[PDB]
Symmetry: C3
Subunit: 265 residues, 3 copies
């Protein structure tokens, strides 16, 4: 597994954005052969989204034939509610680019059969063959999306009960827990692993235990992210604060192995 050690989150976002553009332009997407991109939400990928937008503004990439899949959506919340995952993506990304409505895919949190909605999504992915690049972040406990630790590595898109901790964390909702959704639809670990490439963004001191588990730890189902060690092409892009629990030699190792790719970041 690749590690990209950078100093600040801003550089992480730039490197991640540069990496996404590199892959799009090498792929040469067309209407028949779209580039298929998996996408996350939250504070971490936000620097990436703004780097991408400016790169697009500068004429360095088009999303006209890029198809996207997001990892998550709240169950029960209006799609156009400002706190929906859909809203996060449109207001922080899609609205700023030349992406096409038909090429955007998000889980529908408000159908009358969650199982069927989750299956529809998996089928849609499979209809393109394979996700070309999947971006994500990682929980403090190494989890991915709303998949619990000890999630099966072959787990698929399904409904998840939000943890008590997550719910009180997300109390955007007028400081009210009763308004926070109890369930989310989320992609599975197997759904993730099926991507041709996985790129995980890791920033902040709070993720230091998770990075250690992912980089120096061994394959362990309690730290879901460590499973990427078995994936054919996986990248982690990280900042200096997230490296605190690593050995000095570990950082030295990857900083030098990736030296050529770190230049200009």
């Amino acid at each position: 597994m690749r590690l990209i050690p950078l100093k600040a989150a801003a550089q992480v976002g730039k490197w991640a954005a540069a990496h996404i553009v590199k892959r799009i332009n090498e792929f040469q997407p067309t209407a028949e052969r779209p580039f298929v991109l998996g996408l996350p939400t939250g504070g971490t990928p936000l620097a990436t989204y703004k780097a991408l937008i400016e790169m697009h503004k500068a004429g360095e990439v088009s999303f006209k034939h890029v198809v996207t899949f997001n990892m998550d959506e709240y169950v029960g919340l209006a799609a156009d509610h400002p706190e929906s995952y859909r809203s996060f993506m449109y207001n922080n990304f899609f609205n700023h680019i030349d992406i096409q409505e038909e090429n955007i895919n998000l889980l529908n949190g408000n159908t009358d059969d969650h199982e069927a909605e989750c299956k529809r999504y998996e089928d849609k992915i499979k209809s393109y063959g394979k996700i070309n690049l999947f971006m994500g972040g990682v929980g403090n406990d190494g989890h991915i999306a709303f998949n619990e630790p000890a999630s099966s590595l072959s787990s698929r898109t399904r409904i998840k009960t939000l943890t008590e901790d997550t719910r009180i964390a997300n109390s955007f909702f007028d400081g009210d827990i009763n308004q926070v959704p109890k369930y989310a639809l989320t992609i599975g670990v197997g759904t993730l692993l099926d991507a041709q490439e996985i790129m995980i963004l890791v920033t902040g001191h709070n993720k230091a235990l998770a990075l250690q588990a992912a980089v120096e730890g061994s394959v362990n189902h309690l730290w879901t992210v460590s499973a990427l060690q078995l994936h054919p092409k996986a990248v982690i892009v990280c900042d200096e604060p997230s490296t605190q629990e690593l050995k000095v030699k570990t950082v030295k190792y990857f900083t030098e192995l990736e030296a050529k790719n770190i230049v200009g970041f």
Copy 2:
């Protein structure tokens, strides 16, 4: 991988038995499409067998279209002998339920070609497609069936030489010299090929195995840890087996699986 932390072995057996009944009833087996169930022997699964027999007597499940496969059998011991694995399965389980002779499968320890016998067993499993649910226990050193620690994850059904410790253990039931030297056993790959694996684990002497299984990483010295790579594996355990786990670990799964725990 799932962990079901329960108080005592009695509840483990009942939980496992309920889960087997759920799967059978969800599957709706028929003559054409039987339910295929992998089975272990020994003290631990005994509770499960007895609860199953009760549920069946209560009208809660039928084994008429259930096909079974066992993990092991001794080499050289008469099938009808009281200490055979065949005898264990009939005297403690099969004789009590509506299962059909033609759907019971066990290894034959007394052919003139063990390699072919083992091959025959694998072939028959594959004539049903897959094993739908495989129940097992686990060694103190995390091994499965008669597979050695450090067994290949792709190991198949084969003859195995019994360790002198296992043979010493069984001396009560025979004098060391009349205790069998070899067993036929399914491989780790045989096991992993199942749709679902349920491993029952009870007692203070399995705490290191459980630790390795749940908190440890994937390691060929603890065969059971490979379950972490299985699509659907679940471990059902008792309090004495959790002594080497962290408090937070037990707490995690106890609360995660709470809705599946109630009643047990």
Copy 3:
């Protein structure tokens, strides 16, 4: 995974040779159906090559229908240069046996398309189906061939930049002149290695003690590539006593007893 604990490298070599002989003669190779053998270079496999030669001279095995692939080759260096992997293989093994020229496969380090040459090499391997037995060594840090630690387990045959440590090491064979030492090598990938039907890794010396520990007692871990062999269907490590220094007493005791029958006479 199998661990064969032996006293000294001499016996490790004789064991590995006899295992290679055992697999060839059970396979019974012909023109139509050759035995495909993957091979390493260096001081450690040397003892195996010597014992293989003595076994062949006494009439115990024939390489007439044995097909070979090697792990590595320097980029930019004449293939007949004494320090090429080709030269190692020929001078220490191939010149001494009844192997056929057309059945020998090595990477060409001197084409104008390294990617195309690595692709050609993978294609040739697949044209035989599988490598029946792949013999290798391990780095002090657990790496395989010229694959970096943290190499994808799916990595394929490709060009690799030598670390300065390795280039410092090989400067002796280029007469103390690092500026003579090759900058690149072509190497089979970890996915390439793992595709073999069987993998046998030789581990000798006190300096491989940590790699062997990571490999045998450690868990599956991309920083120690050799630990992925825990996931391979049929892997064996043959090792000497110096290499076991970081293992537990009981770990050596277990495999020594487990493999006692296959150890006798070694």
